[PDB]
């Protein structure tokens, strides 16, 4: 059904939905690992289904449609603790490539495309453990798509090889993020 921000389990999948309270976003949990999000002149939000906790060798499958009109991403998104890391495996995006101005730390080939690896830092920003300063690891797919399979191990290994280590895994989901834009998406995870 439609719901307001929060987290929980839906049809055997962990889900997380958050927004800054600006309005213009509708998140709906569907059957199984399906979820849909429709937004129009939204604020910042993140929504998706996955696992809690994630694993370092999970093969994530996603199928759907993703139609952003503006700034938005479609990625495998999650966190690690000790060290605190926010990571992204970006499969598609809108008007803004999140790696813009970021430091490139390598390339990895996985699931039909080459990905560029980057590391950024967030200073005194909200996190799963409260306001903090932490790094962000990114894997940005060159060939964009809204369906496919993601072998997380290939990314986590490549990151480690470059010196980008991860700690204990927290949640791991396939999420749609938007930043003051419009769009629609319907994705099924498995």
UniProtKB/Swiss-Prot annotation:
Give the record's GO biological process terms: xylan catabolic process
- Carbohydrate attachment sites? 38, 61
Q: Does the keyword Glycoprotein apply?
A: yes
Identify the residues that the record assigns to the GH11 domain, covering every copy. Answer: 1-189
Q: Provide the residue positions that the database annotates as binding substrate.
A: 73, 77, 88, 122, 126, 136, 171
Where does the UniProt annotation locate this protein?
A: Secreted
Establish whether keyword Hydrolase is in the entry.
yes
Going by the UniProt record, its keywords in alphabetical order are: Carbohydrate metabolism, Glycoprotein, Glycosidase, Hydrolase, Polysaccharide degradation, Pyrrolidone carboxylic acid, Secreted, Signal, Xylan degradation
User: Family per UniProt?
Assistant: Belongs to the glycosyl hydrolase 11 (cellulase G) family.
Q: What is this protein called?
A: Endo-1,4-beta-xylanase 2
Q: Show the GO MF annotations.
A: endo-1,4-beta-xylanase activity
Q: Which InterPro entries match?
A: ConA-like_dom_sf, GH11/12, GH11_AS_1, GH11_AS_2, GH11_dom, Glyco_hydro_11
Question: Pfam families, from UniProt?
Answer: Glyco_hydro_11 (PF00457)
């Amino acid at each position: 059904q439609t719901i307001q921000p929060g987290t929980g389990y839906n049809n055997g999948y962990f889900y997380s939905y958050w927004n800054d309270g600006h309005g213009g976003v509708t998140y709906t949990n569907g059957p199984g690992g399906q979820f849909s999000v429709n937004w129009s002149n939204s604020g910042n939000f993140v929504g998706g289904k996955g696992w809690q906790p994630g694993t370092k060798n999970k093969v994530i499958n996603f199928s759907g449609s993703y139609n952003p009109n503006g700034n938005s991403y479609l990625s495998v998104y999650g966190w690690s603790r000790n060290p605190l890391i926010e990571y992204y495996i970006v499969e598609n995006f809108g008007t803004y490539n999140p790696s813009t101005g970021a430091t490139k730390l390598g390339e990895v080939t996985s699931d039909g495309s080459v990905y560029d690896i980057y590391r950024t830092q967030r200073v005194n920003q909200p996190s799963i453990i409260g306001t903090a300063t932490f790094y962000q690891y990114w894997s940005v797919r060159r060939n964009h798509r809204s369906s496919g399979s993601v072998n997380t191990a290939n990314h986590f290994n490549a990151w480690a090889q470059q010196g980008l280590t991860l700690g204990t895994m927290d949640y791991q989901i396939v999420a749609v993020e938007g930043y003051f834009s419009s769009g629609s998406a319907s994705i099924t995870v498995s």
